Write an enzyme that holds these catalytic residues in place. Structure first.
Site, PDB file in Angstrom:
ATOM      1  NE  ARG B 151      68.626 -19.303  93.256  1.00  0.00           N
ATOM      2  CZ  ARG B 151      67.537 -18.855  92.648  1.00  0.00           C
ATOM      3  NH1 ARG B 151      67.105 -19.393  91.520  1.00  0.00           N
ATOM      4  NH2 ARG B 151      66.869 -17.837  93.182  1.00  0.00           N
ATOM      5  CD  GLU B 357      48.816  -7.852  78.198  1.00  0.00           C
ATOM      6  OE1 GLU B 357      49.398  -7.374  77.202  1.00  0.00           O
ATOM      7  OE2 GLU B 357      49.275  -7.771  79.357  1.00  0.00           O
ATOM      8  CG  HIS B 487      62.794  -9.089  85.156  1.00  0.00           C
ATOM      9  ND1 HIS B 487      62.033  -9.648  86.160  1.00  0.00           N
ATOM     10  CD2 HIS B 487      61.964  -8.934  84.098  1.00  0.00           C
ATOM     11  CE1 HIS B 487      60.794  -9.809  85.733  1.00  0.00           C
ATOM     12  NE2 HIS B 487      60.725  -9.384  84.485  1.00  0.00           N
TER      13      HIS B 487
END
Lengths: 98, 594
Positions: B151, B357, B487
């Site tokens: 981190r 998929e 993301h």
């Protein structure tokens, strides 16, 4: 070819409803409206010619299909192109029809 | 005349040329996925050049057409997508600073190397190094040290780029009819210009906190159970009243709980469903896997999947002769050619993501008749919705028993259904409040009514009450830990993994009220039922060309979320959660910090 058979083209625009029994060979540009083409224009002339590509990695609805349309004519003249094949060998000294 | 039909013809010409260009680009992308070579790098460079140039030039040319003068909402939304200027509304110096900061930030995120412990000959990356110290590691101390060092090394490199990123995105989106970049994320989730079934951007916000406060108590009970089991797995460091460390959940970010299944097993005598034994006794390779997949297609009601996949794609490892990657991507070439990138092996997770998929491939062929602006979902969550619906309905072993895939010696008792439901809850329901506060937090960051240099302390103290996780050590404001995500660093729409998480249940109810299936919603087989298959098909073939709200009425019947099917999906698991952690503490406390 993998480069693409872009030689084949189609028109997505036309001057009017295309009539049957006539081939509009010329692909002249069908103008949209409200603006002059001023020659041949990109944004506001809408040339109707569009390509196919037809690469081997296309789809089933995109597959290159070879089409032949045979159309007879009912004009004031009888038939000339028929199949006259009868083809039975022969006979003799036999009570026979022919 | 009218400029409406002129814009329509421009859309048609752009859509045809974009079909051809994206056909070339998708062929190049698949060839790069199966082979990472020098010529494939050149192919992607040329594909990116032609694609970016064509898109930006057609978007520039589309600005001369007025938008809201067309009564046909299909081509009106096509213009709305096409006349999106995007980054074109501002000049080039801010754009090139954006490119420099963002490409440096991406290449810092991708090969961010933690190299503090031991000798520096090793630096633990995500898959080689972090996956063997986070997914499975029986030492709290080493996990804490490695996660804290990771981190720190992410934060001190990511934060100065991310602050300017936030400022740049806010001032980019404030000119493109968005109040912020979060509003751009909700711009696709908006219905304007269509009468009656209106959807707005703040409506999805209040829907998100509505779903959070709706599904709060199920998360309370599963949090109590997982805390009680991690008393057994990780004692002497976690109080029963307080929260939980985020470097023990099985996910380094704190997101998932999928690998936290053996440590939090419901019943030791009964594991989850494992039909893979009869597969490895059956010589059930990837070709027979996809043959069973097409048999399952016919059994559900879907049409059999086309041969265009078969001569165009492979399903196993190609060796080291070509640089293929085992990432499960359902590539569509945009011209009737479907390809699937997956190393399909004898593994239950591989078979379930193959279901995923091929459900993506099914939804890809569902919008096949639409042009290039409309060959998508009406939002990004529909593809993953179809995939996860296919995965979850394929996760019931009753159809495997019926077709002979699973031998009839196994029986589905309550124990196995509790195991399966805890697997599904810790897999994707366990990140519902995680995705909730990350989406809410990134909204209230990008909207920019908040102070700038206090994000980390507030973010690390507000996680104690929504999921109920506590940092064992305090983290100062030099960190940039939430930007350590795929993301957030790549900065994709993380609401997609939120709302889809409810889709795969709510439409599931819509696919079980049409399948004439009763009892618990998790044991629902969409197979052997044409009505549920065609009701799924009704949402399937709509696609992008309609606003997504309309699809939500003709599959569910509301402008808003059918939240309550989650209780139907998890009723035996909820009953077992009530019966299990009733004596232990349910909830969390912020003040307990390890």
């Amino acid at each position: 070819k993998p480069s693409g058979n872009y030689n084949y083209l189609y028109r997505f625009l036309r001057k009017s409803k295309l009539k049957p029994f006539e081939r509009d060979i010329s692909t002249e540009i069908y103008q949209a409206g409200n603006k002059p083409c001023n020659g041949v224009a990109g944004p506001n002339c809408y040339s109707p010619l569009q390509s196919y590509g037809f690469r081997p990695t296309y789809g089933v609805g995109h597959q290159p299909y070879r089409v032949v349309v045979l159309s007879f004519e009912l004009l004031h003249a009888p038939a000339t192109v028929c199949g006259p094949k009868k083809s039975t060998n022969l006979v003799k000294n036999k009570c026979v029809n022919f | 005349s009218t400029i409406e039909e002129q814009a329509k013809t421009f859309l048609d010409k752009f859509n045809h040329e974009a079909e051809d260009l994206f056909y070339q680009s998708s062929l190049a992308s698949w060839n790069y996925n199966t082979n990472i070579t020098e010529e494939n790098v050149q192919n992607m460079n040329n594909a990116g050049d032609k694609w970016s140039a064509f898109l930006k030039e057609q978007s520039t040319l589309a600005q001369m057409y007025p938008l809201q003068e067309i009564q046909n909402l299909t081509v009106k939304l096509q213009l709305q997508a096409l006349q999106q200027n995007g980054s074109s509304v501002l000049s080039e110096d801010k754009s090139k600073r954006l490119n420099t900061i963002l490409n440096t930030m991406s290449t810092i995120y991708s090969t961010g190397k933690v190299c503090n412990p031991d000798n520096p000959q090793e630096c633990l990356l995500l898959e080689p190094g972090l996956n063997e110290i986070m997914a499975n590691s029986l030492d709290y101390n080493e996990r804490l040290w490695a996660w804290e060092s990771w981190r720190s090394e992410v934060g001190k490199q990511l934060r100065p780029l991310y602050e300017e990123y936030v400022v740049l995105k806010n001032e980019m989106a404030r000119a493109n009819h968005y109040e912020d970049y979060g509003d751009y994320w909700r711009g696709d989730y908006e219905v304007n210009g269509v009468d009656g079934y209106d959807y707005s951007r703040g409506q999805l916000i209040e829907d998100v906190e509505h779903t959070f406060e709706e599904i709060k108590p199920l998360y309370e009970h599963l949090h109590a159970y997982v805390r009680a089991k991690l008393m057994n797995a990780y004692p002497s460091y976690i109080s029963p009243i307080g929260c939980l460390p985020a470097h023990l959940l099985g996910d380094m970010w704190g997101r998932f709980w999928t690998n936290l299944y053996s440590l939090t097993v419901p019943f030791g005598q009964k594991p989850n469903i494992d039909v893979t034994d009869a597969m490895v006794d059956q010589a059930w390779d990837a070709q027979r896997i996809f043959k069973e997949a097409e048999k399952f297609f016919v059994s559900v009601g879907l049409p059999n999947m086309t041969q265009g996949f078969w001569e165009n794609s492979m399903l196993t490892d190609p060796g080291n002769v070509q640089k293929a990657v085992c990432h499960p991507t359902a590539w569509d070439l945009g011209k009737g050619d479907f390809r699937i990138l997956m190393c399909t092996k004898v593994t239950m997770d591989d078979f379930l993501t193959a279901h995923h998929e091929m459900g993506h491939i099914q939804y890809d062929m569902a919008y096949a008749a639409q042009p290039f602006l409309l060959r998508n979902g009406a939002n990004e969550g529909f593809h993953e919705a179809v995939g996860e619906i296919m995965s979850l309905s394929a996760a019931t072993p009753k159809h495997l028993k019926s077709i002979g895939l699973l031998s009839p010696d196994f029986q589905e008792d309550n124990e196995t259904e509790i195991n399966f439901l805890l697997k599904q809850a810790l897999t994707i329901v366990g990140t519902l409040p995680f995705t909730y506060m990350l989406e809410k937090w990134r909204w209230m960051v990008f909207k920019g009514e908040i102070p700038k240099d206090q994000w980390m302390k507030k973010w690390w103290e507000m996680k104690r009450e929504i999921v109920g996780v506590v940092e064992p050590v305090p983290h100062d404001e030099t960190y940039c830990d939430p930007a350590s995500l795929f993301h957030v660093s790549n900065d994709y729409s993380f609401i997609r993994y939120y709302t889809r998480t409810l889709y795969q249940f709510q439409f599931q109810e819509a696919l079980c009220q049409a399948a004439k299936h009763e009892g618990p919603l998790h044991k629902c087989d969409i197979s052997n039922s044409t009505e549920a298959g065609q009701k799924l098909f009704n949402m399937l073939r709509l696609g992008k060309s309609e606003p997504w709200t309309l699809a939500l009425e003709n599959v569910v019947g509301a402008k808003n979320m059918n939240v309550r099917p989650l209780l139907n999906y998890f009723e035996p698991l909820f009953t077992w959660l009530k019966d299990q952690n009733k004596n232990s503490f349910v909830g969390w406390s912020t003040d307990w910090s390890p």
